[PDB]
Amino acid sequence: ELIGTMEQIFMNVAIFEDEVFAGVTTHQELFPHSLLSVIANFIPFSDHNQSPRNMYQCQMGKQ
Amino acid sequence: GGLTCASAPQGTLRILEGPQQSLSGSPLQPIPASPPPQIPPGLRPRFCAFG
């Protein structure tokens, strides 16, 4: 389903399959790192380093 | 051909197509969990200490 910008303030999407419940959860993201850009995916182990390190790596790789 | 007026209608039946039944299944169909990474089979020490 192509959820748009205003639908997903009223939809209960879920990230993981375990977080899907009965009656509450109505959608699910495709793969759980979908919230990240193309360049910020290319960072290895993004969930372990701090956030300005990632925001600085995204402008290292473009230099 | 005079077309005189009549009284007030009591109720107004609204005909509309029915709700989409049997569209959603009674269990849900989630994307399956991506598997946790395995230690691959056939791992051995390939580096021998020199001399």
Experimental method: cryo-EM
Q: Can you tell me which residue has the tokens 């380093």?
A: A49
What's the CA dihedral at A51, A54, A59, A63 to 10 degrees? 150
Q: Which one, of A56, A38, A16, lies nearest residue B30 by Cα?
A: A16
The nearest CA of chain B is from the CA of A60 a distance in Å of 29
Are A30 and B31 a contacting pair at CB < 8 A?
A: yes
Whether the Cβ atoms of residue A40 and residue A46 lie closer than 8 Å to each other = yes
For the record, the structure tokens of B24 come out as 């959603």
Q: Which of A20, A26, A27, A29 is the best mutation test for B, with the most CBs of B within 10 A?
A: A20
Contacts of A22 in chain B (CB under 8 A): 28
Whether the Cβ atoms of residue A17 and residue B30 lie closer than 8 Å to each other = yes
